[PDB]
Amino acid sequence: QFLRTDDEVVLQCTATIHKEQQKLCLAAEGFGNRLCFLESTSNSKNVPPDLSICTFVLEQSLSVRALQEMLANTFMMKTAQGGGHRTLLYGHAILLRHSYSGMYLCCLSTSRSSTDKLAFDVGLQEDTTGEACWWTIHPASKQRSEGEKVRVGDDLILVSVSSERYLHLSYLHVDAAFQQTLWSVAPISSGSEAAQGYLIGGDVLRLLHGECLTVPSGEHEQRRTVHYEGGAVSVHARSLWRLETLRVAWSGSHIRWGQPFRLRHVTTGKYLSLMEDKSLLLMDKEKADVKSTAFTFRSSKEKRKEVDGMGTSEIKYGDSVCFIQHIGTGLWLTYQSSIQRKAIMHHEGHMDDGLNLSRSQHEESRTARVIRSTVFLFNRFIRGLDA
Amino acid sequence: NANVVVRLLIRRGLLAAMEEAIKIGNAIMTFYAALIDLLGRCAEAIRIRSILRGDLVGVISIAFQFCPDHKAAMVLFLDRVYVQDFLLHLLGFLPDLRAAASLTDMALALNRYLCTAVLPLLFAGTEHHASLIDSLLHTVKGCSLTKAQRDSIEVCLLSRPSMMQHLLRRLVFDVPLLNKMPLKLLTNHYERCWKYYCLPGGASEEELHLSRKLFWGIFDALYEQELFKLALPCLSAVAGALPPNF
């Protein structure tokens, strides 16, 4: 209904290049990247956009006077300073923490682009040292005025404090120009989250088997097969699966049964592509269509889409007797026969369709993303050295 | 007013094609000189100085080439927005002070840049003092030229010191042509500067003897000449302290 402290949201422009629906959300890679870029949300059907590195969390909402308090001490913010959750007004000075990296979005001191005279570029940094991290919001509305509350889905203007510049989409950079640019808000996940032990989207997890799901190791295949393995594979960094939802807005909502979700391994990127010809296979990032990859979650073997909120966590992690079904073919996940118990998608299967879930944790994801970024960086390095 | 004016100017390359038409009609050059003269009148505030802050190559292009207004606009812009050694190193009126000894657009450009080149109060230094030593006796306006002469004396009080010895030598070589009142005051200024700097002094002995002989022959010749001869006793003190046109 409104915006408070710690509301995970995104930003979203609608670029009208050649009257298209050329849509995009703002990205921040980090852990090797000190520049920002975009993420196309237009053709989300055929090639689904990455979403775990495009969300942001409002850590603090202040007036100008608290910013001169930051001028006063030569930090500690009096631990809020204030409340509470401090529902956001227009004209406040907000702070955008990146939701994954933990870095803060700032206005940089360089112009590593066009030229285009003296604007600046947009990137992350470490700390709130100085005015370069804070962002005044001006209302982009003759409808509403300044100093009043900010509702769900408002069109506004982001202006920094130090550079005192816009947050401007270039033609294709995102930089600090002197022209206005709308920046809308989609509430993803807030808040809180909601009681412990809940299926909520955006979470990375596993599936117990008694034993877990897995992927074979590297130096290969190109890791495009699916096995099972018992042992300590939960400790391993290759048994990692992320519940990627379908909606852009309210993507971090709760999880019922019924509704389908895309799936993707955290250290590969090649989606869990159930190729509807035979059985369980693996293909790339561009393959993941509507019907091709997303799996429906059924409470039994038997067999909404529009919720404007967090909603009901139907399933905990303990009693997660879950029954994965594909959208179209209606197949169900059962096995066949360093255990080479290969799983298949079959109509009937065994009684071992009823497997139990298990969440992952923070730092495991906070390294697992670093794994894929490091590996693809070094393989580009290997290409350059073989060149 | 400066704050709000500069901000809403920022609301609504340029020099890459703006130095096009020095050849080509006296309108766009004075236009951009007017805009840069407006922006040269605005001194928290570090954040707007960052907004004003790459222009220097265009400045030095303007500072060394219709003309005599745009240079003064950039002079004020540089002196407000933007050390003595590097600021003096970019000689910015070296060809202009060179052209200050070629005396009607020049006849008003000279008084126009008398009060404009005071701001140089705040090898190449030798050539700059050389061109100034010709520019100062090159007009012997009156009061503005005397202010520029006092500025040259205070510039000579700054700095190496062999350049100051050569400048005092140039004053002692020019004063012998009068032994007009401007050269007498300039040699009085060099005499006072040598009297202040005689502790580094105490080649130069015979030139100092010739200068003291010229001062003795001037003092044995019996009003601006009265003030110059009263300052000449400080030159005798400079001789007894350090050692003891063209």
3-state secondary structure chain B: CHHHHHHHHHHCCHHHHHCCCCCCCCCHHHHHHHHHHHHCCCCCCHHHHHHHCCCHHHHHHHCCCCCCCHHHHHHHHHHHHCCHHHHHHCCCCHHHHHHHHCCCHHHHHHHHHHCCCCHHHCCHHHHHHHHHHHHHHHHCCCHHHHHHHHHHHHHHCCCCHHHHHHHHHHHHHHHHHCCCHHHHHHHHHHHHHHHHCHHHHCCHHHHHHHHHHHHHHHHCCCCHHHHHHHHHHHHHHHHHHCCCCC
Ordered strands of the A295-298 beta sheet: A343-346, A332-335, A323-326, A295-298, A260-265, A241-244, A204-207, A357-359
d(CA B210, CA A122): 70
Helix or strand or coil: residue A107? strand
Q: Which residue of A has its CA nearest to B16?
A: A117
* Chain A residues with CB-CB distance to B47 below 8 A: 131, 162-164
* Rg, Å, chain B Cα set: 22
Spatial CA neighbour of A240 closest among A379, A356, A369, A332:
A369
Which member of A117, A163, A178 has the closest CB to residue B14? A117
Chain centre to alpha carbon of residue B7: 35
* Chain A residues with CB-CB distance to B13 below 8 A: 115, 117
* Chain B residues with CB-CB distance to A162 below 8 A: 47
How near does any CA of chain B get to the CA of A23, in Å? Answer: 27
d(CA A294, CA A247): 12
Contact of B156 with B123, CB cutoff 8 Å: no
d(CA A257, CA A274): 20
Sequence-distant (6+) residues with CB within 8 A of A295 are A260, A261, A263, A272, A274, A324, A325, A326, A327
* Chain B residues with CB-CB distance to A164 below 8 A: 7, 47, 51
* Chain B residues with CB-CB distance to A131 below 8 A: 47
Assign residue A95 a region (left: φ > 0; alpha: ψ between -120 and 50; beta: otherwise): beta
Residue given tokens 């955290």 in the structure block:
A266
How near does any CA of chain A get to the CA of B47, in Å? Answer: 7
* Positive or negative: CA dihedral A233, A235, A241, A243: positive
How near does any CA of chain B get to the CA of A56, in Å? Answer: 27
d(CA A160, CA A175): 12
Is A324 exposed, middle or buried (CB count within 10 Å of its CB: 0-12, 13-18, 19+)? Answer: buried
Tokens of A254: 């709760």
Contact A131 B47 (CB under 8 A): yes
Residue among B39, B47, B53, B56 with most chain A CBs within 10 A, to mutate: B47
Contact of B178 with B228, CB cutoff 8 Å: no
Residue given tokens 């699966």 in the structure block:
A241
Helix or strand or coil: residue A67? helix
Long-range contacts: A340-344, Cβ < 8 Å, 24+? A340/A227, A341/A211, A341/A227, A341/A228, A342/A226, A342/A227, A342/A228, A343/A213, A343/A226, A343/A227, A343/A228, A343/A280, A344/A279, A344/A280
Tokens of B120: 């140089």
Contact B13 A117 (CB under 8 A): yes
d(CA B218, CA B175): 11
Helix or strand or coil: residue A233? coil
Q: Count of residues for chain B? A: 246
Solving technique: cryo-EM
Chain centre to alpha carbon of residue A149: 26
Q: Count of residues for chain A? A: 387
Contact A162 B47 (CB under 8 A): yes
Amino acid at A9: V
Cis peptide before A191 (omega within 30 of 0): yes
Q: Which residue of B has its CA nearest to A179?
A: B11
How near does any CA of chain B get to the CA of A203, in Å? Answer: 42
Sequence-distant (6+) residues with CB within 8 A of A260 are A246, A294, A295, A296, A297, A327
Contact A178 B13 (CB under 8 A): no
* Positive or negative: CA dihedral A88, A91, A93, A98: positive
Angstrom distances, CA of residue A169 to CA of A14, A23, A263, A374: 10, 12, 31, 29
- Beta partners for residue A169, in sequence order: A174
Contact of A243 with A260, CB cutoff 8 Å: no
Q: Which residue of B has its CA nearest to A68?
A: B44
Helix or strand or coil: residue A332? strand
Contact of A92 with A61, CB cutoff 8 Å: yes
Sequence-distant (6+) residues with CB within 8 A of A354 are A321, A322, A323
Contact B10 A117 (CB under 8 A): no
Which member of B11, B47, B53 has the closest CB to residue A178? B11
Query: What's the CA angle centered on A65, arms A63 and A69, to 5 degrees?
Result: 120
Give the end-to-end CA distance of chain A in Å, rounded to a whole number: 55
Contact B12 A178 (CB under 8 A): yes
User: What is the stated resolution of the deposited model, in angstroms?
Assistant: 4.2
* Phi, psi values for residue A230, rounded to 5°: -90, -145
Angstrom distances, CA of residue B146 to CA of B99, B100, B134: 19, 15, 14
Pairing of strands A174-175, A168-169: antiparallel
Chain centre to alpha carbon of residue B90: 14
Contact B47 A178 (CB under 8 A): no
A interface with B, Cβ–Cβ < 8 A, is 115, 117-118, 131, 162-164, 178
* Positive or negative: CA dihedral A105, A107, A108, A113: positive
* Chain B residues with CB-CB distance to A117 below 8 A: 13-14
Contact of A140 with A50, CB cutoff 8 Å: no
- Composition of chain A by helix, strand, coil, percent to 5: 10, 30, 60
Half-sphere exposure of A12 (CA within 13 A, CB side): 20
Contact of B186 with B136, CB cutoff 8 Å: yes
Give the end-to-end CA distance of chain B in Å, rounded to a whole number: 52
* Chain B residues with CB-CB distance to A118 below 8 A: 51, 53-54
Angstrom distances, CA of residue A343 to CA of A235, A272, A336: 21, 13, 6
Contact A131 B12 (CB under 8 A): no
Spatial CA neighbour of B119 closest among B88, B142, B98, B89:
B88
* Positive or negative: CA dihedral B231, B236, B239, B240: negative
DSSP A285: S
How near does any CA of chain B get to the CA of A178, in Å? Answer: 6
- How many other CB atoms are found less than 10 A from the CB of residue A302? 7
Q: Which residue of B has its CA nearest to A114?
A: B13
d(CA A139, CA A152): 13
The three state secondary structure string of A17-45 is: HHHCCEEEEEEECCCCCCCEEEEECCCCC
Contact of A242 with A178, CB cutoff 8 Å: no
Contact of A94 with A60, CB cutoff 8 Å: yes
Q: Which residue of A has its CA nearest to B53?
A: A118
d(CA B69, CA B27): 12
Q: b/e map of A36-66 (b: 16 or more CB within 10 Å)?
A: bebbebeebeeebbebbbbbbbbebbbeeeb
* Chain A residues with CB-CB distance to B14 below 8 A: 117
Contact of A201 with A294, CB cutoff 8 Å: no
Contact of A362 with A368, CB cutoff 8 Å: no
